[PDB]
Amino acid sequence: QAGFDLLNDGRPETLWLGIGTLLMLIGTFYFIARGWGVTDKEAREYYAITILVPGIASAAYLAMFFGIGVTEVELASGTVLDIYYARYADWLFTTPLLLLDLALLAKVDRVTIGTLIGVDALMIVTGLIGALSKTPLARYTWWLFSTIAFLFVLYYLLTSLRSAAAKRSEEVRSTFNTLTALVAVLWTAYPILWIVGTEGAGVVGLGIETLAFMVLDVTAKVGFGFVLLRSRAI
Amino acid sequence: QAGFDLLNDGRPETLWLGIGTLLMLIGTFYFIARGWGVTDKEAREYYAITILVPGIASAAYLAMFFGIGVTEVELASGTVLDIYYARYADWLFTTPLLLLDLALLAKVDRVTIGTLIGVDALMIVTGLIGALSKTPLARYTWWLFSTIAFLFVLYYLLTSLRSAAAKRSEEVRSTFNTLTALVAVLWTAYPILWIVGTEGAGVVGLGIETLAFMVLDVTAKVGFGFVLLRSRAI
Amino acid sequence: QAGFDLLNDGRPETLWLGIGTLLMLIGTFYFIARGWGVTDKEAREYYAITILVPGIASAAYLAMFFGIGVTEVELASGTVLDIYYARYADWLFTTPLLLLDLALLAKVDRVTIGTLIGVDALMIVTGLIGALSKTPLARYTWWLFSTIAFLFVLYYLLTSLRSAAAKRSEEVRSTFNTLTALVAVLWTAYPILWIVGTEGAGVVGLGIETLAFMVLDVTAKVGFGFVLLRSRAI
Ligand SMILES: CC(C)CCC[C@@H](C)CCC[C@@H](C)CCC[C@@H](C)CCOC[C@@H](CO)OCC[C@H](C)CCC[C@H](C)CCC[C@H](C)CCCC(C)C
Ligand SMILES: CC(C)CCC[C@@H](C)CCC[C@@H](C)CCC[C@@H](C)CCOC[C@@H](CO)OCC[C@H](C)CCC[C@H](C)CCC[C@H](C)CCCC(C)C
Ligand SMILES: CC(C)CCC[C@@H](C)CCC[C@@H](C)CCC[C@@H](C)CCOC[C@@H](CO)OCC[C@H](C)CCC[C@H](C)CCC[C@H](C)CCCC(C)C
Ligand SMILES: CC(C)=CCC/C(C)=C/CC/C(C)=C/CC/C=C(\C)CC/C=C(\C)CCC=C(C)C
Ligand SMILES: *C/C=C(C)/C=C/C=C(C)/C=C/C1=C(C)CCCC1(C)C
Ligand SMILES: *C/C=C(C)/C=C/C=C(C)/C=C/C1=C(C)CCCC1(C)C
Ligand SMILES: *C/C=C(C)/C=C/C=C(C)/C=C/C1=C(C)CCCC1(C)C
C-alpha cells in the first residue's frame, strides 16, 4: 500500500503509524509542558484528562507501529484481513476521556456522564467485535450495533450537554460549541472510513486508511486538546 | 444438542442464543422507552444503570450467537469443551451494575459499594479462569475460589445492604427485599449450572445448559429491571 | 531452574508460585479477620482497598501456579521465552489500589489521584506489551516507555502526595513516610529485575526471578498492608 515499509516487515503503512506515534508523543509532552505550573483546580482537571488522551494514543500507535497491535483475521471467504485491533484498546479509554472533557465544560450531571461513558464504551467494544468477525453478516451487524450506540452518544451531546452548556458564560459556551462541532464532524468520519476501508468494503486500501485514521486521530486528540487547553473557558 | 442450528455451523444452541439476544434487545429498548421523559434525578440514575444491563447482555448474546463468543478448550483428558467465554465479559460489567442498583435502593455507604463491586468482579474473573482451565484440579479449584467470593457477595447483601435498607420507607424496603430475594435465588443457580453443565461434570448437555442460562439471564436482567423500574421505590 | 516442579509439568518455579499463592491467601484472610468488626468509616476504607490487594494477587499467583498465567513468546531470534503475563493483570488493579492507600493517607485531591492511577495503569499496560514483544528493539523501547511512566508516578508521590501528607498529624506523616519509602525502594526493583531477568537480558534465570518477584510482591502487598493496617494513622 501507500507509505514506506519502515521496519522491513512488509507494511508500508508503518510510515503513517510512525508519524502518528511521533505526533501523539509531541502533543502529550506539549500539554504536559503547558500544564506544568497550573494551579487552578478546574484547569488542572482538564489538563490531567487531556494529557492522557494523546498519551494513551501514543502507546497504541507505537504498538501498531512495531506490529504487536495488528492481527490477521481470516474471513469466511478466505480473505485474510490485517486488523489494527490496538485502535479499539486506545478508543475505549480515550473516547470516554474526550467526552468527560465536554461534560466538564458543560457542567452536566453525573448520571449524564455515566450514561455517555457507558454507551460510548459499548460503541467501541462492539466495533472491535465487528472488526474481528469472520462472516460478512456478523461484521455488518456489529457496525450497525456500534453505529446505533454512536447515535445515542451524538444525541446526548447535542441535547443534554448542549442544554447544560447554555447555562454557562459566553466564553465557556464558545469553547464547548467549537469542540462539540469538531466531535460531531470528526467522529462521524470513523464509522464511514471503517465501512469503506479494509474492515468493510475494501474500497480504500490499508495504506490510505492508516494515513486517514492518523489525521483524524491527531486532529481529534491533539487538535481538540490544543483548542481546549488554550481556552479561557477553564 | 437441544435446539436448532440456526447458522448451519453445527451449533443447535444458537436457537437459545438468538432468542436470548432478541429478549435482551426488547428489554433494553422497553426500558429506554419507559425512561425517556423521566426527570427525577434519582429515577434517571436507576434507569441509566438498568438499561445498560440488558444492553451489555445484548452484545454478549449476539457475539455468542454469531460464534466469536465461544472458544474451544482442550482438557488434559483430550476432551474438547466449547466454552462460551463471552458470558464472563457480560457478567463482569452487568453483575456490578445490578449490585449498584441494590446499593442505591439501600442507600449504603460508598465503601460497601466499592467492596461489593470488587469482590463480585473477582468472582467473575476467577470463574472465567476456571472455565478456560485445562486440568480438573484447576477447574474445580477456581470454581471453589469464585464460589467463596460469591459467598462474600451474598453476605454483604444480606447483612450490610439489608440493614441499610431497613432505614428506608416500607415501599423502598418492599422493593429492595423482593429484588434481593430474586438475586439470592437466581444467582445461586449459576455456580450450580456451571458445575453440573459442560464446564463441570457434563451431566447437563450444552443445549439445555444454554437454554437454562438464557432463562436465568433474562429473569435476572429484564425481570429484575422490570420489577425495579416499575416501582414507586424510586 | 531453581525450585521444585510441583505439578510435574517441567516448571521448577511453581515451588515459588505455590508459596506466593499461600502467602497472599494468608495475608488476605489475616486482613479480613483483623478488619472484621472495624466501624470507623475511614479505617474500613483502608481495610477494603488493602484486602483486595493480596486477594487479587492470590488469584494471579494461583493462575501462574496452575499454568494458565504463563504464555510462550517466540522472539525474532528464535528464543522461546516463558512470560508470566498474569503478573500484569494483577498489577493493573493492585498498583492503583496501593497508590490509593497512599493518596488517602496524604488526603490529596481527586485530580492527583486520577493522575496517579492513569499514569500507573499506563506503566503496567506498556510493561505487558514489552513482555510480549517479539523484537529486542520493541521490548526495550517499551521498558523505556513504562519506566518513564514509573518516573512520573514516583514524582507525584514524592512531590504532590508528600506535600499534602505534610499537613497531617505526626502519626499520619510517620506512616505515610514509611510506606512511601517502602514503595520508592521496592517498586524500583521491578523494572530492574525485568531488564536483568528472562524478560530482558536473561542474566537471572526464571527460577530465581520468580522467587525474587514473590519476595517483592509479598513485601509490597502483605508487608505494606500490615504496616498500614496496624497503624494509628487511620
Ligand atoms: C491490555 C489491557 C490490560 C488494556 C485494556 C485493553 C482493552 C480495552 C482492549 C481489548 C484488547 C483486545 C482488542 C485484544 C484482542 C486481540 C486478539 C484478536 C488477539 C491478538 O493478540 C495477539 C497477542 C500477541 O501474539 O497480543 C495480545 C495483546 C494484549 C491483549 C494487549 C495489548 C493491547 C494493545 C496493544 C494496547 C495499547 C493500548 C494502550 C497501551 C492502553 C493503555 C491505557 C491505560 C491507561 C489503561
Ligand atoms: C473486549 C474488552 C475491551 C471488554 C472487556 C472484556 C473483559 C471484561 C472480559 C475478558 C475477555 C476474555 C474472556 C477473552 C478471553 C478469550 C480467549 C480464550 C481467546 C478467544 O478469543 C478469540 C478471538 C478471535 O479469534 O477473539 C478475541 C475477542 C476479544 C478478547 C473481545 C471480545 C469479548 C466479548 C465477545 C465481548 C462481549 C461483551 C460486551 C460487548 C461488553 C461490552 C460492555 C462495555 C460497556 C464495556
Ligand atoms: C481477565 C480480565 C477480565 C481481567 C482484566 C485483565 C487485564 C487487566 C490484563 C490483560 C490480560 C492480558 C495480559 C492477556 C494477554 C495474554 C495473551 C498473550 C494470550 C495468552 O492467553 C491464553 C489463554 C488460554 O489458552 O488465556 C486467556 C486468559 C484471559 C485473557 C484472562 C486471564 C488473566 C489472568 C490469569 C487473571 C489473573 C488476575 C486476577 C484474577 C484479576 C482479577 C481482579 C478483579 C477484581 C478485576
Ligand atoms: C488476547 C486475549 C485473549 C484477550 C485480552 C483480554 C482483555 C480483553 C482484558 C481487558 C479487560 C479490561 C478492559 C477490564 C476493564 C477495566 C475497566 C475499568 C477497571 C474501569 C473502571 C474504573 C472504575 C472503578 C472507576 C469508577 C470511578 C468512581 C470514582 C466514580
Ligand atoms: C481518538 C479517537 C477517536 C475520537 C475515535 C473515535 C471513534 C469512533 C467514534 C468509532 C466509531 C465506530 C462506529 C460508529 C461503528 C463501528 C466502527 C467504529 C468503532 C469505528
Ligand atoms: C446477568 C447475569 C448474572 C446475574 C450472572 C450471575 C453469575 C454468577 C453469580 C456466577 C457465579 C459463578 C460462581 C459462583 C462460581 C464459578 C462459576 C461462576 C461464574 C458461574
Ligand atoms: C504488587 C505489585 C507491585 C507493587 C508491582 C510493581 C510493579 C512495577 C512498579 C513495574 C514496573 C515496570 C517498569 C517500570 C518497566 C517495565 C517492567 C515493569 C512492569 C516491570
Author numbering:
A (entry chain A), B (entry chain A), C (entry chain A): 1 to 234
The authors write:
Archaerhodopsin-2 (aR2), the sole protein found in the claret membrane of Halorubrum sp. Although the structure of the proton-release pathway is highly conserved among proton-pumping archaeal rhodopsins, aR2 possesses the following peculiar structural features: (i) the motional freedom of the tryptophan residue that makes contact with the C13 methyl group of retinal is restricted, affecting the formation/decay kinetics of the L state, and (ii) the N-terminal polypeptide folds into an Ω-loop, which may play a role in organizing the higher-order structure.
This crystal is made up of membranous layers, in each of which the aR2 trimers are arranged on a hexagonal lattice. In space group H32, one subunit of aR2 is contained in the asymmetric unit; i.e. the aR2 trimer is supposed to have perfect threefold symmetry. Owing to these properties, the new crystal provided accurate structural information about functionally important residues. It is shown that two glutamates (Glu199 and Glu209) in the proton-release channel are separated by a very short distance (2.3 Å). Although most residues in the retinal-binding pocket are highly conserved in proton-pumping archaeal rhodopsins, Met145 in bR is replaced by phenylalanine (Phe150) in aR2.
